[PDB]
From a paper:
It produced diffracting crystals in several different crystallization conditions, which enabled us to determine its structure by X-ray crystallography at 1.59 Å resolution. The binary complex shows a segregation of charges on its molecular surface, with one face being predominantly negatively, and the opposite positively, charged. The former presents two conspicuous hydrophobic cavities (arrows) surrounded by acidic residues and separated by W366, similar to the histone-binding pockets seen in other PHD fingers. Two sets of contacts mediate the interaction between hPHD and HD1. The first involves primarily β sheet H bonds between PHD β5 (S387, V389, and G391) and HD1 β1 (Y178, V179, and F180). These intermolecular interactions depend mainly on backbone atoms. The second set of contacts comprises a network of hydrophobic side chains, as well as two H bonds (formed by HD1 N186 side chains and PHD backbone atoms). These side-chain contacts involve either invariant residues (T375, A378, and L382) or a semiconserved PHD residue (M374). Likewise, the HD1 residues involved in these hydrophobic interactions are either invariant (T182, A185, N186, A189, and I200) or semiconserved (V201).
Molecularly, BCL9/Lgs proteins function as adaptors between Pygo and Armadillo/β-catenin, by binding through their homology domain 1 (HD1) to the PHD finger in the C terminus of Pygo, and through their homology domain 2 (HD2) to the Armadillo repeat domain of Armadillo/β-catenin (Kramps et al., 2002; Städeli and Basler, 2005). We show that human and Drosophila Pygo PHD fingers associate with their cognate HD1 domains from BCL9/Legless to bind specifically to the histone H3 tail methylated at lysine 4 (H3K4me). Therefore, this is a prime example of histone tail binding by a PHD finger (of Pygo) being modulated by a cofactor (BCL9/Legless).
Author numbering:
A (entry chain A): 341 to 397
B (entry chain B): 171 to 205
Write the structure that this text describes.
């Protein structure tokens, strides 16, 4: 899956995040600007998902 | 059986802000919404 921001492949050993607002693209965490701590908290919370800037705007 | 669930959708900005709130001891969790 190509990262929705940088176009490079989102690999298994990279922090990956899926847009669950609509587009269902994968992104590298780092490309989104999300902190590692925010990513850890969001991925641990079952009632919380992420939406990309495009789908949220 | 049939259920419905509310799922909160965070932008990057609001994910980062919610983490800051947790770190600052202001809320227990990133979905601890309040007044
Ligand atoms: Na989550
Ligand atoms: Na997500
Ligand atoms: Zn990327
Ligand atoms: Zn999206």
């Amino acid at each position: 899956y190509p990262c929705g921001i940088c176009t490079n492949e989102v690999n298994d050993d990279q922090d990956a995040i899926l847009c669950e607002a609509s587009c269902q693209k994968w992104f590298h965490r780092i490309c989104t600007g999300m902190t590692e701590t925010a990513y850890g908290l969001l991925t641990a919370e079952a009632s919380a998902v992420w939406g990309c800037d495009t789908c949220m705007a | 059986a049939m259920a419905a669930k509310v799922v909160y959708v965070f932008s990057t900005e609001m994910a980062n802000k919610a983490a800051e709130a947790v770190l600052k001891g202001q809320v227990e969790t990133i979905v601890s919404f309040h007044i």
